[PDB]
């Protein structure tokens, strides 16, 4: 090791996901998020070495100035081992910022889990390695607030969570201020789309869209989803009146056409 001089005002640390040793779904990108905006994005990329077994072609794309993603063209093949070496220690990241340390993570791809929410049938169907394991009636976004179509990556899971409209800057005791307690919530977009328990819409699930954009399912189906779906599994939404989920949402990565993703967007 070669020592690098440093100052707490001129250092930035990388954080890698997913965690070391984790088993993730086929949609999980590698994510490296820095604790500061990066000016030399080309230098960061060059510092990161991703190796796969079986080997598959992949590429980097920046979600924003803090976070870079790497994925293949198509969903991961189950069983794949992925090694990530972020060799940023002492790397000049531009504007006098330097990499603070190296981080190394290793993870594996589990079963192919793909759930399709079809707005034509109002059924959410979960396939594991091509086989249907579960059908759930669902209620998605009403016409004024539709659920976007596209490919969503499963993120965090919560036994209980608060949906508070003021974090979207729209207060309660307001036009639409809500503060709502929700059980068994699985996050599928950074914009705040969740699959979750909705006892208040059980009669509509399978028939009519009534939500603000979330996938409302029954309490027991929502608990099922929470138990059986992991980070990196895929939810595909089709046939809604909405547009397409933004590719830079945070969990929207697969919505970016491969030619654009591969070309990348790194200021070098
Ligand atoms: C889920 O139902 C939650 C709501 N779902 C949303 C979504 O589908 O993205 C948003 S509301 C929607 C997104 N953009 C519009 C807006 O005015 N902004 C918030 C910027 C409307 C919301 C988190 C919630 C009800 O649990």
Numbering used by the authors: 141 to 408
Paper text:
To provide a detailed structural view of how meropenem inhibits LdtMt2, we have determined the crystal structure of LdtMt2Δ130 as a covalent complex with meropenem. Each chain of the meropenem complex contains one meropenem linked to Cys354 by a thioester bond. In the meropenem-complexed structure meropenem is covalently bound to Cys354, mimicking the acyl-enzyme intermediate, and the carbonyl O atom of the opened β-lactam ring is stabilized by the oxyanion hole. In chain B of the meropenem-complex model, clear electron density for meropenem that is contiguous with the Sγ atom of Cys354 was observed, but the electron density was missing beyond the thioether S atom of meropenem. The bond distance between Cys354 Sγ and the carbonyl C atom of meropenem is 1.94 Å, which falls within the typical bond distances (1.81–2.55 Å) of carbon–sulfur single bonds. The ζ-­hydroxyl group of Tyr308 interacts with the meropenem N1 atom and the thioether S atom of meropenem C3. In addition, the pyrroline ring of meropenem is stabilized by the aromatic ring of Tyr308 through hydrophobic interactions. The backbone carbonyl groups of Ser331 and His352, as well as the side chain of His352, also make hydrogen bonds to the bound meropenem. Upon the acylation of LdtMt2 by meropenem, the active-site lid undergoes a large conformational change and partially covers the catalytic Cys354 so that the bound meropenem is accessible to the bulk solvent via three narrow paths. A large conformational change in the active-site lid of LdtMt2 upon acylation by meropenem to partially cover the bound meropenem may explain the long-lived acylated enzyme intermediate.
